[PDB]
Design a protein around this ligand. Structure first.
Ligand SMILES: CCCCCCCCN[C@H]1[C@H](O)[C@@H](O)[C@@H](O)[C@H]1CO
Ligand code: NA
Ligand code: NA
Ligand code: NA
Ligand code: NA
Length: 538
């Protein structure tokens, strides 16, 4: 009965439709070795503590086809049953031809048979442990197994507990830019396919001729993109679920060279190749392990496009990362999924939290508690209207802030500069919001930031003068956007409340102290409807 999940894109906005309405993945992803029935008891408690609505978890080629033609979906059976018992949804991660550039999750009969399923050859003739996207046997084998997984979901997942599939994991190659095998050179030292030369507005020729100094990297990205599109089409012909690829990001400011980063993945410089080569892949999702605000903000900008829904398919699970939920959703993002949210005795520190404990989880639970009570309403406003979101824009001071060695004039100057940086403006049409971080709930002492950095805010427009507002360790203040020609302005009314059956239910009116000094949020959840008014005095 249930309509298929679908990614919609209209008027440069996006929605992930689940059960016929926009949905936000408030996600969690397991560690990489939790894809087994015995591991799930170490997954669910963290997911319930986090309040996540969707679990991302691997389904490995080596586990569903351990002997060629001998399929085993015993894990998928247990996973679907246990997800449904907990009323959560699933994103399955197809670990196959590539998992972090390598074939470690391909069956032994694949990854130990280089002649049938061939590896990238470097220019010097050394071989890398990265399967070539020009291996036709490898493409056929991956596609065949992925089709069998999709047939399992077609037959056994009629209500779409699984809402989306990631095809491969962090594709590309470390250690070279492309395959330089004889097989690969015969394709490289030849015409660029008609279809790519058209989609990019370029002149006919060989890879070297039309792309020059980008030929090696664009060639790898196109061939991988084509490989992933073919797997994707084969699977969607069985069940047309949304499907996506995740990116082992290059640093957007100082990337270095392809092969230092994972060459051929959907890095920012080849998104045009990926979009032209792989029209069947719904979106290209960034995997975010940069901790600093400016780099993360740049990633969110680069991956949010009229042709690309923003899904933060992975993000580090350390404390600093939780606040990026707010700009992700403010960009119209469809979801956010911290990595390593299970108690299987692993942490990917230095990428994530040094320690995995209930405090680690709580940093994400606290932000999820702001969005879960309005998730369907937010998702619709994000698609059909105007939303905004911001995070605290200074990172935690390093055990260095050099700050103490500064002079006592350099210091008041430091404090004014920090207060300015911790003050964000948002243009909401007739009204602006100013968001500030780390100050009392009364009076106007300048902001000093939270320790550690943690704050954020979400705003959705309900009407010309009315906004839905929730924020965290932050003050939000409204003002007129344009000079008012004689008129004055006030807050007309602030209500705290909730949605029941899609209707607003008031709990209380914020007024007095609670609205004299902006709208002040701590760690606790409050959903507000704010109505502003200009009024005549003359
Ligand atoms: C700031 C520098 C970050 C560079 C390292 C990024 C690689 C990130 N790889 C991610 C994969 O998609 C996951 O399966 C898992 O392996 C994860 C890392 O725990
Ligand atoms: Na959206
Ligand atoms: Na305006
Ligand atoms: Na304005
Ligand atoms: Na409330």
């Amino acid at each position: 009965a249930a309509p298929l999940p679908e990614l919609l894109s209209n008027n440069g906005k996006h929605a992930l439709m689940v059960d016929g309405a926009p949905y936000i993945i408030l996600g969690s992803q397991t560690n990489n070795s939790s894809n087994y029935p015995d591991a799930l008891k170490d997954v669910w408690p963290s997911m319930e503590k986090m309040g996540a609505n969707t679990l991302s978890i691997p389904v490995a080629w080596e586990q569903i086809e351990p002997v060629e033609g001998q399929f085993d979906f015993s894990f998928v059976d247990v996973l679907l049953k246990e997800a449904r018992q907990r009323k959560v949804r699933l994103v399955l991660l197809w670990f196959a031809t590539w998992k972090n550039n390598a074939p470690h999750y391909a069956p032994a009969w694949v990854k130990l048979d280089n002649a049938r399923f061939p590896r990238v050859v470097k220019e010097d003739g050394d071989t890398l442990n990265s399967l070539s996207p020009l291996g036709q046997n490898t493409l056929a084998a991956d596609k065949k197994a992925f089709v069998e997984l999709m047939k399992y979901l077609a037959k056994r997942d009629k209500d779409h507990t699984v809402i989306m599939v990631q095809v491969q994991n962090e594709v590309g190659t470390y250690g070279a830019v492309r395959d330089y095998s004889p097989m690969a050179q015969a394709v490289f030292n030849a015409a660029v396919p008609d279809d790519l030369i058209q989609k990019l507005q370029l002149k006919p020729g060989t890879w070297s001729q039309v792309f020059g100094r980008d030929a090696d990297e664009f060639f790898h990205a196109y061939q991988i993109a084509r490989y992933c599109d073919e797997v994707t089409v084969a699977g969607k012909a069985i069940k047309n679920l949304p499907m996506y690829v995740n990116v082992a990001l290059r640093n957007p400011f100082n990337p270095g060279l392809p092969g230092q980063y994972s060459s051929g993945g959907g890095t920012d410089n080849v998104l045009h190749i990926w979009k032209a080569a792989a029209p069947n892949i719904d979106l290209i999702a960034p995997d975010i392990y940069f901790r600093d605000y400016k780099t993360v903000s740049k990633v969110l900008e680069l991956y949010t496009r009229p042709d690309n829904a923003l899904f933060v398919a992975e993000i580090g699970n350390d404390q600093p990362f939780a606040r990026y939920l707010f700009p992700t959703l403010g960009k119209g993002g469809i979801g956010f999924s911290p990595f390593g949210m299970d108690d299987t005795d692993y942490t990917n520190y230095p990428l994530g939290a040094k320690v995995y404990n209930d405090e680690t989880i709580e940093q994400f639970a606290q932000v999820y508690r702001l969005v879960n009570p309005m998730m369907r309403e937010w998702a619709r406003l994000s698609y059909q209207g105007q939303v905004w979101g911001v995070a605290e824009p200074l990172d935690s001071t390093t055990e260095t802030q050099w700050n103490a060695e500064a002079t006592p004039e350099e210091k008041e100057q430091h404090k004014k500069d920090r207060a300015s940086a911790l003050t964000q403006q948002l243009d909401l049409g007739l009204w602006d919001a100013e968001v500030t971080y780390g100050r009392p709930m009364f009076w106007v002492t300048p902001p000093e930031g939270n320790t550690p950095a943690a704050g954020g805010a979400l705003i959705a427009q309900l009407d010309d003068n009315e906004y839905l507002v929730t924020a965290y360790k932050a003050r939000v203040e409204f003002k007129p956007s344009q000079e008012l020609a004689g008129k004055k302005f006030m807050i007309e009314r602030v209500e705290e409340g909730r949605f029941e059956k899609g209707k607003w239910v008031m709990e209380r009116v914020w007024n007095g102290d609670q609205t004299d000094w902006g709208l002040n949020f701590t760690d606790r959840p409050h959903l507000l409807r704010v109505k502003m008014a200009s009024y005549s005095v003359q």
